């Protein structure tokens, strides 16, 4: 039903909230939840692990079946699969892991996938252990995504830093 609440409106189409994406998916029941995936869809930790555990491992079983038939994704690519109990669909998006030396230019390619969905609940791509500068990731989102994106950032200090930087 996409009933998002408690978000700050940064631009005409980008919103942000200090929240756990799993709890937001349970509260909002969005049409699309974005997963910060890796190319072989192994959802063991971070955001992907949090989403998979909230589906009681249904997301991992479906992803394994996808990988068996189709092989891995490319960095910057995406895949629509079921959202299980969290959303109607899960858009698995692979942003670059700059801590492992992947190309930061592909973060624009990763956000470009959001433009195929009129409204999405999403994490901040390539942040956390993927090592991208989180302020840069928020700027790429703002400049690339035209559809309505609701970013959940589960860290108060990071959220406050992103907001303060954007409002300069
Ligand atoms: C209690 C269960 N929930 C969680 O653990 C949880 C964690 C979490 C979250 N983490 C951010 C984040 C954003 C992007 C990426 C990562 C981490 S990663 O997994 O380190 C690598 C892939 C890219 C941090 C930057 C704050 N953002 C929103 N909702 C969340 N929920």
Swiss-Prot record:
Membrane-topology descriptor: Multi-pass membrane protein
Subunit structure: May form homohexamers. Interacts with N protein.
Function: Responsible for the cleavages located at the N-terminus of the replicase polyprotein. Participates together with nsp4 in the assembly of virally-induced cytoplasmic double-membrane vesicles necessary for viral replication. Antagonizes innate immune induction of type I interferon by blocking the phosphorylation, dimerization and subsequent nuclear translocation of host IRF3. Also prevents host NF-kappa-B signaling. In addition, PL-PRO possesses a deubiquitinating/deISGylating activity and processes both 'Lys-48'- and 'Lys-63'-linked polyubiquitin chains from cellular substrates.
Protein name according to UniProt: Papain-like protease nsp3
UniProt superkingdom: Viruses
Cellular compartments annotated: Host endoplasmic reticulum membrane
Regulation: Inhibited in vitro by GRL-0617.
Catalyzed reactions per annotation: Thiol-dependent hydrolysis of ester, thioester, amide, peptide and isopeptide bonds formed by the C-terminal Gly of ubiquitin (a 76-residue protein attached to proteins as an intracellular targeting signal)
Span of domain Macro: 1-168
């Amino acid at each position: 039903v996409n009933s998002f609440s408690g978000y700050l409106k940064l631009t005409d189409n980008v919103y942000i909230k200090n929240a756990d994406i799993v709890e937001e998916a349970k509260k909002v029941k969005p049409t699309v939840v974005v997963n910060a995936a890796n190319v072989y869809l192994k959802h063991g930790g971070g955001v992907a692990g949090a989403l998979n555990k909230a589906t009681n491992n249904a997301m991992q079983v479906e992803s394994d079946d996808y990988i068996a038939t189709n092989g891995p994704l490319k960095v910057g690519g995406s895949c629509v699969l079921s959202g299980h109990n969290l959303a109607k669909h899960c858009l698995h998006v692979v942003g670059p892991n700059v801590n492992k030396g992947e190309d930061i230019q592909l973060l624009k390619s990763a956000y470009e996938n959001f433009n195929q969905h009129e409204v999405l609940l999403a994490p901040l791509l390539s942040a956390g252990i993927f090592g991208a500068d989180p302020i840069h990731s928020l700027r790429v989102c703002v400049d690339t995504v035209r559809t309505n994106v609701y970013l959940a950032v589960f860290d108060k200090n990071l959220y406050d830093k992103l907001v303060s930087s954007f409002l300069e």
